[PDB]
Amino acid sequence: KIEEGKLVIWINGDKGYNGLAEVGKKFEKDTGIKVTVEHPDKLEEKFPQVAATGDGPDIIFWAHDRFGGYAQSGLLAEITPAAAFQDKLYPFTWDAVRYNGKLIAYPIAVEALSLIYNKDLLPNPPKTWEEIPALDKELKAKGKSALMFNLQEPYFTWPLIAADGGYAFKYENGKYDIKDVGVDNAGAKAGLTFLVDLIKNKHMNADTDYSIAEAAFNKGETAMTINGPWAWSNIDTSAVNYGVTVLPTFKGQPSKPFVGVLSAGINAASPNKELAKEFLENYLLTDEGLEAVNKDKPLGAVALKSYEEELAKDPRIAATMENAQKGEIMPNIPQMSAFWYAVRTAVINAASGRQTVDAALAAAQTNAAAMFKNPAERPRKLHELSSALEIPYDELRLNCVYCKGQLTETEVLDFAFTDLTIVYRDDTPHGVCTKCLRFYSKVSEFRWYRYSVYGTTLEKLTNKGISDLLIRCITCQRPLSPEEKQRHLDKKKRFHNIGGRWTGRCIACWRRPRTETQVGSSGAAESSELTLQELLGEE
Ligand SMILES: OC[C@H]1O[C@H](O[C@H]2[C@H](O)[C@@H](O)[C@@H](O)O[C@@H]2CO)[C@H](O)[C@@H](O)[C@@H]1O
Numbered sequence: 229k230i231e232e233g234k235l236v237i238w239i240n241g242d243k244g245y246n247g248l249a250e251v252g253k254k255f256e257k258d259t260g261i262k263v264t265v266e267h268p269d270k271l272e273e274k275f276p277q278v279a280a281t282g283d284g285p286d287i288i289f290w291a292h293d294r295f296g297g298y299a300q301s302g303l304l305a306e307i308t309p310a311a312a313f314q315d316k317l318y319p320f321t322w323d324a325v326r327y328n329g330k331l332i333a334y335p336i337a338v339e340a341l342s343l344i345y346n347k348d349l350l351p352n353p354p355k356t357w358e359e360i361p362a363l364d365k366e367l368k369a370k371g372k373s374a375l376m377f378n379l380q381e382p383y384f385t386w387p388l389i390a391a392d393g394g395y396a397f398k399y400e401n402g403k404y405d406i407k408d409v410g411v412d413n414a415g416a417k418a419g420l421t422f423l424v425d426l427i428k429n430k431h432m433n434a435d436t437d438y439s440i441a442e443a444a445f446n447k448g449e450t451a452m453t454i455n456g457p458w459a460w461s462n463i464d465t466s467a468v469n470y471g472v473t474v475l476p477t478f479k480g481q482p483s484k485p486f487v488g489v490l491s492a493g494i495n496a497a498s499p500n501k502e503l504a505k506e507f508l509e510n511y512l513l514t515d516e517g518l519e520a521v522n523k524d525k526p527l528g529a530v531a532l533k534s535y536e537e538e539l540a541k542d543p544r545i546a547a548t549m550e551n552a553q554k555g556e557i558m559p560n561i562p563q564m565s566a567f568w569y570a571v572r573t574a575v576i577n578a579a580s581g582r583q584t585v586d587a588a589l590a591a592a593q594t595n596a597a598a599m600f601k602n603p604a605e606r607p608r609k610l611h612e613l614s615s616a617l618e619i620p621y622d623e624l625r626l627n628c629v630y631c632k633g634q635l636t637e638t639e640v641l642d643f644a645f646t647d648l649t650i651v652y653r654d655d656t657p658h659g660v661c662t663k664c665l666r667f668y669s670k671v672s673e674f675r676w677y678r679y680s681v682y683g684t685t686l687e688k689l690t691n692k693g694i695s696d697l698l699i700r701c702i703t704c705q706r707p708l709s710p711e712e713k714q715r716h717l718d719k720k721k722r723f724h725n726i727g728g729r730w731t732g733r734c735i736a737c738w739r740r741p742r743t744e745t746q747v748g749s750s751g752a753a754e755s756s757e758l759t760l761q762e763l764l765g766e767e
């Protein structure tokens with residue numbers, strides 16, 4: 229459910245959202261369409277969750293690596309601009325947004341990590357990585373540190389891991405081989421072991437995240453840090469005499485940062501699909517719109533040929549553009565979400581000592597191709613599970629979350645038609661059988677019944693129409709059709725609130741002929757109620 233005549237924009241909270249709002253306010257002052265820009269927490273995981281249900285924003289902003297898994301799930305609307313529009317951007321920026329030979333987003337700016345050093349504490353920056361442990365002990369005796377950067381996200385650590393030979397998926401003959409993963413080779417191990425050696429020798433702290441590393445550098449407590457173009461203005465507010473230069477070398481090899489291309493996607497369920505096309509083309513992809521976002525938090529090396537040449541002489545942009553040449557462009561295959569999750573748990577568990585470097589990377593090697601390891605992005609509905617597994621519904625082997633018995637063909641169908649969400653235990657998808665579902669639905673009515681109300685009253689108190697409220701069957705949990713909801717209104721039968729959920733009775737459960745028995749099948753102690761709420765969508 230997305231409004232008409234209105235565009236909602238989502239962007240990362242560190243990419244300068246207030247600058248994009250200025251571009252939107254001029255779009256509303258000229259076109260009359262109120263464009264709202266927001267920045268949700270973890271929008272790269274929250275977007276596919278809410279885009280699958282046809283909801284979400286109209287415009288999604290992120291690097292190109294996540295856009296492949298979106299459009300593959302049918303979440304991104306394809307884009308076909310004009311014959312003269314593709315010419316004002318660099319051609320390699322469109323390559324990063326081309327999935328299955330079709331454009332899926334609007335390329336904006338090219339991102340790449342760089343070294344950020346304090347010129348007062350550190351006159352000349354270190355050229356290599358190995359010369360930092362000795363440099364830290366010099367600053368340690370003065371009360372400061374050498375380096376502090378975000379260790380909780382693998383994007384900042386990847387340049388060191390890819391330095392001696394680590395890679396994501398082998399790229400050859402124009403295709404990425406998801407079978408050949410290079411996160412556990414000698415190059416990857418050497419890069420991560422050197423990072424853990426910095427933690428063991430107490431040169432860095434594994435607890436350091438983006439804010440801690442940023443607050444410690446902007447206060448003057450660390451000599452240098454690793455970040456992107458978005459953090460330049462945050463140091464400009466402080467009086468830190470900083471410098472942006474090339475990344476240090478590891479084993480004499482250049483660091484290989486994963487080059488990110490910030491892109492703009494349009495939700496396939498957005499009614500204003502062409503209203504959002506002319507906005508990005510005529511208001512963001514102009515020289516003034518990019519400057520407003522760059523004044524807030526810098527975008528790096530933008531793709532627009534016009535405005536890029538103006539600030540191409542930037543000593544910070546030149547260093548970012550050089551780090552991008554020695555790195556490599558991020559793949560846009562759908563497996564990138566599972567890859568980043570495997571490396572993130574590999575780096576964190578290796579930094580904290582939860583497991584050795586070999587153990588973390590070996591687990592990451594197998595988890596890079598897995599599907600259910602990432603709890604955020606995971607098949608929630610049955611058709612998503614079958615499409616992800618590439619197996620039909622009758623070949624699925626789903627056990628009940630309660631009794632661990634395998635569902636039959638008809639129960640798998642019932643699970644999908646009832647709009648039940650897949651439940652995961654030990655990273656394994658589960659469903660629910662007919663016996664367990666109708667039992668705990670009645671146990672829930674016996675224990676967590678709150679109140680009942682007429683459908684006419686329910687509208688006036690939620691100030692929403694009855695066909696917009698999700699009402700499930702009190703006995704079989706099937707979502708009531710608009711015709712079944714109108715059934716309660718005409719017959720003057722109240723709806724029932726069980727545990728905060730509103731329920732009614734569908735066509736099949738309206739009578740329940742006498743020949744049937746009351747439900748008694750099962751194959752504080754409220755844990756069954758929490759499991760049921762997972763099956764219905766965690767409120
Ligand atoms: O760390 C995994 C993460 O890496 C990148 O995320 C970057 C984002 O791309 C950068 O532009 C910047 O925002 O920092 C993020 C790291 O926290 C990839 O862009 C993203 O696909 C991936 O999840």
Ligand SMILES: [Zn+2]
Nearest residue numbers: 628631661664
């Ligand atoms: Zn069961």
Ligand SMILES: [Zn+2]
Nearest residue numbers: 701704734737
């Ligand atoms: Zn029913």
